[PDB]
């Protein structure tokens, strides 16, 4: 099992996907066996957003509450700085701030010629910063429907 994170694990509350406006509790925690080889009150456990320092705790447990996150993805990486050795990246979290999806206001289906494949077009609306899945369903007079997903 390749493990991306060994020295320590970082958790996010409630989740990596959050509604625009919500506040995430990024918490960097270090496993007891791993740590700075020489205890010293100089080593720190920094947390960086886009390589920008947001917090620093000498103790293994680091707690942060980032707020006003804009729409998009922010990489919070939690590195360990020892006394003389260079910083070792320990673990990180990628947060996607998103909003509720826009409903398609107008739907039009056009078939080209007497023999043609029906094609339906919609107005997506504002782009939510999240993966979007679109399902188009066509039902005839009685209920018999064709199911197609635009992943």
């Amino acid at each position: 099992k390749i493990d991306a994170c060994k020295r320590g694990d970082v958790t996010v509350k409630p989740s990596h996907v959050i509604l625009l406006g919500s506040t995430v509790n990024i918490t960097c925690s270090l496993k007891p066996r791993q740590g700075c080889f020489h205890y010293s009150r100089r080593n720190k456990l920094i947390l960086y957003k886009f390589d920008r320092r947001i917090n620093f705790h000498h103790g293994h447990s680091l707690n942060s509450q980032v707020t006003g996150l804009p729409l998009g993805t922010t990489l919070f990486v939690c590195k360990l700085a020892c006394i003389n050795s260079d910083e070792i990246q320990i673990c990180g979290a990628e947060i996607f701030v998103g909003v509720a999806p826009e409903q398609p206001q107008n739907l039009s289906c056009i078939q080209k010629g007497e023999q043609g494949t029906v094609a339906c077009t919609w107005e997506r609306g504002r782009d939510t910063h999240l993966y979007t899945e679109y399902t188009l369903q066509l039902s005839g007079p009685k209920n018999l429907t064709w199911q197609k997903q635009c992943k």
Binding site: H38, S40, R42, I83, N84
Partner: protein, 303 residues
């Protein structure tokens, strides 16, 4: 703390800040019990302590040296003391000098010329006398007696600035009998530098392929094509390089600039044809074809 580098030698770790209290150090002698053992530090007959046990905090370098266990007029045992200074919680690094060519804090530079596993490590130190080095090596930590490092030897005495840095190198051969296609563990080399009463240690981890540096191309000869301006040049693989030459391959870069800025041409083939200006030399270089390796020394034939 106090630990034994070797029998009768005890390295003591001390913090280095002004007016520092010393660690309580206890001296013991493994000899038949004698009532009245005396203890000396200097060659002078000044007697430091009596009894089979001597207590002396090593607050400074003066308090570290060969304590002598002597009773009855015969020296029962010997207690040499070595010091590992720690400054601001960081181990001292004074004996060797930082080359810095790969990156900062680099004191050991190792190289190889073959996939056999024979490699040599060069360290530059500016201390002229009273210098000894202990070298140990292993593949990862799993192999016991994995590598058979040889003994440090002074190699050169160059005059950089006025310091006259002296270069000391070791010859180490991977003693693993089983051949293996790819390496999963980096070879680790530790040099236990010792100077007078001061002890330092340096650790370097590397892979043979990364440190490999090929020797210059062999039997380079120029053969002019009949009735043509261009001249064919043919070279051969070095004998020292590992065999077979099919599994392990090299890439030759040919520069004809001699004495227009860059005539370098990269040819896998052992013969390339280059127009020869009468007033220039043609030179060839060798690198591992498969992975990025240090370039070989230029081989130049007059043209």
């Amino acid at each position: 703390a106090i630990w034994e580098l070797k029998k009768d030698v005890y390295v003591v770790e001390l913090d280095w800040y002004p007016d520092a209290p010393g660690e309580m150090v206890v001296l013991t002698c493994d000899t038949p019990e004698e009532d009245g053992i005396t203890w000396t530090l200097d060659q002078s007959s000044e007697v430091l302590g009596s009894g089979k046990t001597l207590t002396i905090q090593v607050k400074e370098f003066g308090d570290a040296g060969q304590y002598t266990c002597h009773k009855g007029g015969e020296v029962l045992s010997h207690s040499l003391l070595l010091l590992h200074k720690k400054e601001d919680g960081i181990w001292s690094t004074d004996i060797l000098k930082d080359q810095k060519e790969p990156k900062n804090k680099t004191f050991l530079r190792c190289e190889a010329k073959n996939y056999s596993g024979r490699f040599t490590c060069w360290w530059l130190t500016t201390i002229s006398t009273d210098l000894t080095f202990s070298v140990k090596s292993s593949r990862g930590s799993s192999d016991p007696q994995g590598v058979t490092c040889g003994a440090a030897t002074l190699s050169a005495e160059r005059v950089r600035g006025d310091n006259k840095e002296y270069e000391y190198s070791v010859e180490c051969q991977e003693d693993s009998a089983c051949p293996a296609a790819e390496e999963s563990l980096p070879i680790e080399v530790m040099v236990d530098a010792v100077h007078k009463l001061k002890y330092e240690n340096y650790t370097s981890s590397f892979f043979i392929r990364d440190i490999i540096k090929p020797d210059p191309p062999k039997n380079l000869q120029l053969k002019p094509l009949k009735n043509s301006r261009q001249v064919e040049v043919s070279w051969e693989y070095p004998d020292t390089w590992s065999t077979p030459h099919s599994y392990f391959s090299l890439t030759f870069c040919v520069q004809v600039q001699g004495k227009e800025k860059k005539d370098r041409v990269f040819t896998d083939k052992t013969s390339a044809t280059v127009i020869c200006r009468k007033n220039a030399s043609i030179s060839v270089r060798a690198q591992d074809r498969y992975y990025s390796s240090s370039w070989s020394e230029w081989a130049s034939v007059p043209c």
